[PDB]
């Protein structure tokens, strides 16, 4: 019943301290459990705005589908709807440096990996500096080279990231 | 020195292509080829690959003295790419109601090369053949039925299939409360245990606690919302108990 406590927090509201917004979208959420768990928030919460413009912030950089779900993570310590919807997820948590949610969400990516897309993965775990990630889809592409190649996603990854064909061409080499 | 049997390493696997064809010869009992005369078929093929050509080849009265009187029928492959195939076969003849009757079978798979002509000698006697009671010449036609089966001996395998990873999905939920107590991080509120000073917080006592929330809430959080004294317990204990409910063990 650890989970639905702390959720009380956010589905009841309960009473928070500061005003979120998720590109006009109102959001109640509280500065203890964010400057807790979340080191890019507690950095944030402390330097330069508590004094000032505290009750007001803008996050006008994330969805709400999915800020609903990292919301309900840090609270509730679970996130339900992760496996349908983990691409931009990762994105989210590594903006904000949630080490654990990105571990997850890596862990539902490399799980639903597919020849037609490794491109595409490879390409968000170089932009999102996943480690774990991109050995598994580097070890992916070096077993299935015979037909990803093919793909339209590799030859833009090609075009457009040299230096992802460059690491894997040599984690194969030897 | 030495020199036993040599390993392969690999499992024994073998493709077998099984195609046939049907030769019919009209007005067979007017062919009228002598001793030593063949009369050889039409190229066909299997249809998998058409590099490999086959043509059967009969002789009406059969080549040599020991084959006298005997139809001699023969399987040649006319061109191939420089390899050598390992085929098997079989001719039959099919009679005037249908069920082929003369099945002569090849025990095992014959290497052929291009020009190269397995097959047997002494197929049927002449005699027997026209006898016109046994029904092999419908309409004075002969029907031949030959079944060839490539054997080619592949290996089709595969290799690593590297399961998806990782384990481990580490959680460390301790650590972090651990944080707002030792490091004591910025509390809100100043509790107080029988004069001595502790600092928390109000959303995890609201929330892990019901009494905290109610006190917190009525009557409280409108005048006196930074200081409660909790001055009804010993402070060796009630650290102990405020361990507890924010980290989750009692140590």
Request: hydrophobic share 40%; glycine share 4%.
């Amino acid at each position: 019943r650890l989970a639905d406590e702390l959720g009380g927090l956010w589905e009841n509201s309960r009473f928070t301290d500061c005003c979120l917004c998720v590109a006009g979208q109102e959001f109640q959420a509280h500065k203890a459990i964010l400057a807790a768990r979340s080191p890019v928030f507690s950095a944030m919460f402390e330097h330069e705005m508590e004094e000032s413009k505290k009750n007001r912030v803008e996050i006008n950089d994330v969805e709400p589908e999915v800020f609903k779900e990292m919301m309900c993570f840090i609270y509730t310590g679970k996130a339900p709807n992760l496996d349908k919807m983990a691409d931009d997820l990762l994105a989210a948590a590594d903006k904000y440096a949630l080490e654990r949610l990105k571990v997850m969400c890596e862990d539902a990516l490399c799980s639903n990996l597919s020849v037609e897309n490794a491109a595409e993965i490879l390409i968000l775990a170089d932009l999102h500096s996943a480690d774990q990630l991109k050995t598994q889809a580097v070890d992916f592409i070096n077993y299935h080279a015979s037909d990803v190649l093919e793909t339209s996603g590799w030859k833009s990854m090609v075009v457009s990231h040299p230096h992802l064909v460059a690491e894997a061409y040599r984690s194969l080499a030897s | 020195s030495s020199g036993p049997v040599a390993e392969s390493r690999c499992y024994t696997q073998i493709k077998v292509v099984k195609f046939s064809y049907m030769w019919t010869i009209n007005n067979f009992s007017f062919c009228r080829e002598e001793m030593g005369e063949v009369i050889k078929s039409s190229t066909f093929s299997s249809g998998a690959n058409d590099k490999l050509k086959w043509c059967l080849r009969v002789n009406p009265k059969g080549l040599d003295e020991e084959s006298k009187d005997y139809l001699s029928l023969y399987l040649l492959l006319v061109s191939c790419p420089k390899s050598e195939v390992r085929a098997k076969f079989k001719f039959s003849i099919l009679n005037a109601k249908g069920e082929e009757t003369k099945a002569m079978e090849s025990q095992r798979a014959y290497r052929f090369v291009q020009g190269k002509d397995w097959g047997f000698k002494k197929f049927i006697r002449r005699d027997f053949l026209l006898d016109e009671a046994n029904g092999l010449l419908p309409d004075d036609k002969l029907t031949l039925f030959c079944e060839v089966s490539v054997v080619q001996d592949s290996v089709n395998i595969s290799g690593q299939n590297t399961m998806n990873m990782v384990k481990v999905p580490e959680c460390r939920l301790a650590d972090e409360l651990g944080g707002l107590w030792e490091n004591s991080r910025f509390t809100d509120c100043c509790l107080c245990v029988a004069g001595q000073e502790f600092q928390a917080h109000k959303a995890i006592l609201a929330a892990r606690s019901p009494v905290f929330s109610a006190m917190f809430e009525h009557e409280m959080e409108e005048s006196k919302k930074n200081r409660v004294e909790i001055n009804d317990v010993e402070p060796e204990v009630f650290k102990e108990m405020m361990c507890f409910i924010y980290t989750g063990k009692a140590p």
